[PDB]
Amino acid sequence: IRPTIGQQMETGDQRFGDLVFRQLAPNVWQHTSYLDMPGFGAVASNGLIVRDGGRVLVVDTAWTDDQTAQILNWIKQEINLPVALAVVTHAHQDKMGGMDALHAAGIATYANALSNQLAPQEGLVAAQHSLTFAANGWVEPATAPNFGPLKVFYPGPGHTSDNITVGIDGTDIAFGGCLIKDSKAKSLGNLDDADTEHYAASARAFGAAFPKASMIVMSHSAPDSRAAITHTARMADKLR
Ligand SMILES: CC1(C)S[C@H]([C@H](NC(=O)[C@H](N)c2ccccc2)C(=O)O)N[C@H]1C(=O)O
Ligand SMILES: [Cl-]
Ligand SMILES: [Cl-]
Ligand SMILES: [Cl-]
Ligand SMILES: [Cl-]
Ligand code: NA
Ligand SMILES: [Zn+2]
Ligand SMILES: [Zn+2]
Numbered sequence: 527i528r529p530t531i532g533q534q535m536e537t538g539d540q541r542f543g544d545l546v547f548r549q550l551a552p553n554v555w556q557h558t559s560y561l562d563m564p565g566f567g568a569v570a571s572n573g574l575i576v577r578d579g580g581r582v583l584v585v586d587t588a589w590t591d592d593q594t595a596q597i598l599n600w601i602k603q604e605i606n607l608p609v610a611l612a613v614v615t616h617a618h619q620d621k622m623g624g625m626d627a628l629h630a631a632g633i634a635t636y637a638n639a640l641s642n643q644l645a646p647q648e649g650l651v652a653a654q655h656s657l658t659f660a661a662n663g664w665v666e667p668a669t670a671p672n673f674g675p676l677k678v679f680y681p682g683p684g685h686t687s688d689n690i691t692v693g694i695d696g697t698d699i700a701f702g703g704c705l706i707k708d709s710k711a712k713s714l715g716n717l718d719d720a721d722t723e724h725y726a727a728s729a730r731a732f733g734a735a736f737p738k739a740s741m742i743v744m745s746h747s748a749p750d751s752r753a754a755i756t757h758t759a760r761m762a763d764k765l766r
Contacts, residue, residue: 529560532570533748540604543596545588546570547604550741550749551697553577553675555604557597559588561619571620571745574701575601576694578674581610584633585676585692585701586745587624594624598631609633613676614653615703616689617644618719620745625651636670638680640688657690663731665690679735681705683721684728684762685714693736700739702732702754707744707761709753714761715746726762729755 527535540547546558555575560568573586575597582601587594601609611634614622622645628635635653637645642652657678658666665678677693685704692701705728707714714725721728733755742754 528568529570530563530567531746532558532560532568532572536748542600542603545593545596545600547575547600550699550743551694554694554697554699556743556749557584557586557588557600559590559593559597561589569620569746572743573621574692574694574699574743575605576675577605577607578610580607581674582607583674583676584609584612584628586615586621586703587612587628589619589623591624591627594627595631597624598627598633610672610674611636612653613637613657613673613678613690613692614641615692615701616686617641617648617650618686618704619648619650621703622648622650622653625653629654638688638690641690644686644688663735677736679732681731681735682724682728684725685716686719687721689728691732691735693739698738698740699743699749700732700736700741701743702758704745705729705732705758706742706754707758708747708750709757711747711757711761714758714765717765722762722765725765726759729759729762733759
């Protein structure tokens with residue numbers, strides 16, 4: 527039950543197969559999957575599940591196809607509405623490891639064009655659709671058709687050059703993915719593929735994109751305050 531990296535079990539977490547689901551809002555769930563790193567233990571990765579009327583929107587895969595299938599299973603059981611689309615927040619295993627499971631389920635997948643271009647080099651499957659972004663980082667609306675409350679924002683390079691973020695419009699929830707670390711984080715996680723020059727501005731950009739989101743959901747920590755953004759940014763300031 528207990529990851530080395532990620533939030534531990536708390537009451538109101540629902541354990542379903544190998545995954546954990548935490549209701550954040552009437553219409554928003556966090557999905558948590560665990561990659562058993564040999565010798566390091568389980569690494570939690572969080573995405574989101576959003577009910578938008580008669581359809582469900584997914585943010586990020588699990589680490590694996592098998593885990594992402596369990597997410598669909600959980601959605602089927604708990605919401606029992608079709609998954610309209612998945613948005614995946616950059617081309618790394620924690621965010622796009624389960625693309626095949628979404629595709630096999632006939633779920634329309636969207637990623638940053640650059641994530642799609644990077645997917646093959648990262649041993650991953652591209653999303654079937656490419657999000658492009660304006661100079662101010664907002665998704666080009668035509669590339670994000672019928673996204674409902676998923677408000678996609680490319681904050682700039684940080685965790686990766688392709689990392690994107692998702693505000694859940696009509697909620698106080700914004701999703702920073704692996705760009706954002708919790709307010710008590712000692713580390714910015716894996717900086718291997720990171721843009722250390724732009725990280726801070728990108729963390730802040732995310733904050734300013736979703737100025738009214740009080741609940742910040744991220745890949746490897748329990749949903750947190752805006753302090754997650756500000757702390758991530760302050761840590762990122764040291765990188766320059
Ligand atoms: C949680 C991480 C430290 S690992 C993860 C990602 N890495 C992977 O998905 C790798 N496939 C992986 C290899 C070994 C152990 C865990 C993940 C990355 O490089 O951002 N995201 C990192 C992050 O968000 O900082
Ligand atoms: Cl709620
Ligand atoms: Cl503008
Ligand atoms: Cl906002
Ligand atoms: Cl700090
Ligand atoms: Na890489
Ligand atoms: Zn990553
Ligand atoms: Zn990550």
